Design a protein around this ligand. Structure first.
Ligand SMILES: Nc1nc(Cl)nc2c1ncn2[C@@H]1O[C@H](CO)[C@@H](O)[C@@H]1F
Ligand SMILES: Nc1nc(Cl)nc2c1ncn2[C@@H]1O[C@H](CO)[C@@H](O)[C@@H]1F
Ligand SMILES: Nc1nc(Cl)nc2c1ncn2[C@@H]1O[C@H](CO)[C@@H](O)[C@@H]1F
Ligand SMILES: Nc1nc(Cl)nc2c1ncn2[C@@H]1O[C@H](CO)[C@@H](O)[C@@H]1F
Ligand SMILES: [Mg+2]
Ligand SMILES: [Mg+2]
Lengths: 154, 153, 154, 154
């Protein structure tokens, strides 16, 4: 059937080693669920970075990808989470996309007891049961008891 | 008549920043005839004894961005605040007017065109985005920049 | 009560509003205790930024000032705390300077349950009683029940 | 003769995927030069993390490790660099250890023209030729033309 499209938002493309070693396993786990993965660092591989307007066109391309995804899978590691990822997450919330968060970072960093991060990151998630959309390890992505799988199966 | 600006900032996280940094910016925005929605003030009366206060603040902030006319996002720091970034994103996706403020003199970015991550500028024009980018509090009321022009059609 | 030299390490010089509104109140609070305050953004205001070596000169003068102060007063607001403040805090720890920390940020941001920040920031403070060196408001700075006041009388 | 000891300071132990996949390749790059690698997350994995005082014990062990290493190899990826790495780098500078910086993150984030990061990170490096101590990929670590190799071989 038409594979669901996930926009995989991450800061992992800014580092040589992270792009090479951290992203492929996450892409693989998502694809093992039957997902069509739009990964921005891969999807922008061929830009003419010769050109001065390259940054604006990457921004417009990323904006179109988020508007056309079915859901976002946002890597929100780091203190704080990446600002580009955060802009993409807020776009997804406002457009009623499916929302899934990933953080295998064990530091807690927040102003509230309910959420391990700034509360805005959870605005598009339900009040009760948001943890089902919150993944804390790559091997958890495949879980039939978590929200990504449930969302794929109607 | 007056347009509504959502003033997104991390300045409510420090007692000193909330009292000393925010009022001057609120004053500058109001002196242009803008009705300013400042989230830390607008949620002063939310029951912070309750466990669900974080969810109610998040929905209130989401509703405010949906109902504001523009966002005025304080994007100081390396990197800019993540909640501000989420709210700027809602605003871009909802076709709100967008204005950015950064009086931080550090450059922190992935590109030479823009002083920050290019996603922050996704909702601004390709040419002339700098007219929407304020680098000092006293620049806010400048008649040559985008905020004043936006009020006067 | 002695006139000891405090190096006042902060990121508040990087923002125009912060430099003029947040930093002076902390300078005054320390000076109200009879401290000689070494504030780096003012102390290096007489440097020649016109030529390209100004960053190496400022880095060296900051290093000397930590070498010669009696204690550091590190403003460790932000998520995370400022990296230059962090380097200078590490210099002061290794140099056995007195250590005092300031955080009026409400957000707890940490690896661990003992301390509100990354544990390394506290390596130079006692195992028990470190709270007495940890200041969470401008008003608290002058309290005679906290370590800064007692250090001046020692 | 005793092998030179490098303290490998990084935030990579806070993320399960980063600890597993990013650290081993760097440890191997350093060991292939004959270095004894002190990596803090592994060196403290035997501490009893059920007890409340573990945070203090890790801080003191990290402090002692920096005092007893010959050099530090500081992973300063991220915006900004990790605050614990920064404290450990500051300790290393004040204690006249050899200093080496690693950043394969292509984002530039700084207050100056000369350096790609906050100028304090370079205070322990010479004014001229500091780039020789600054590594931008795992593959560069072994370069016979950069400062680590020269430091090992007199
Ligand atoms: N320079 C950039 N290149 C690419 Cl391919 N993507 C970028 C860039 N800057 C920001 N982004 C986008 O924003 C996030 C990283 O900040 C990613 O989800 C996505 F890559
Ligand atoms: N705790 C918070 N309270 C309020 Cl009223 N707003 C918050 C809170 N945490 C995050 N935010 C929202 O996100 C931004 C700061 O992260 C602000 O624009 C806005 F306040
Ligand atoms: N550009 C800088 N100028 C001065 Cl005077 N000090 C600086 C600069 N960049 C970093 N620092 C120093 O490091 C910290 C800020 O990162 C301060 O404690 C101290 F100011
Ligand atoms: N929880 C921590 N455990 C260990 Cl072993 N080291 C830590 C911890 N938190 C901070 N650090 C130290 O500071 C840096 C990470 O912030 C590392 O160089 C070193 F690990
Ligand atoms: Mg099919
Ligand atoms: Mg299955």
């Amino acid at each position: 059937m038409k594979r669901k499209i996930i926009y995989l938002a991450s800061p992992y493309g800014f580092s040589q080693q992270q792009k090479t070693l951290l992203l492929p396993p996450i892409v693989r786990a998502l694809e093992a669920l039957g997902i069509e993965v739009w990964e921005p660092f891969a999807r922008n591989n061929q830009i003419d970075f010769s050109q001065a307007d390259w940054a604006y066109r990457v921004a417009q391309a990323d904006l179109q990808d988020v508007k056309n995804c079915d859901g976002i899978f946002a890597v929100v590691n780091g203190t704080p989470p990446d600002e580009g990822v955060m802009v993409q997450l807020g776009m997804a919330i406002a457009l009623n996309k499916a929302i899934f968060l990933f953080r295998d970072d064990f530091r807690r960093c927040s102003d509230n007891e309910r959420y391990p991060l700034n509360l805005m990151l959870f605005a598009g998630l339900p009040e009760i049961g948001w943890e089902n959309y919150y993944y804390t390890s790559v091997d958890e992505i495949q879980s039939h008891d978590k929200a990504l799988y449930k969302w794929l199966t109607g």
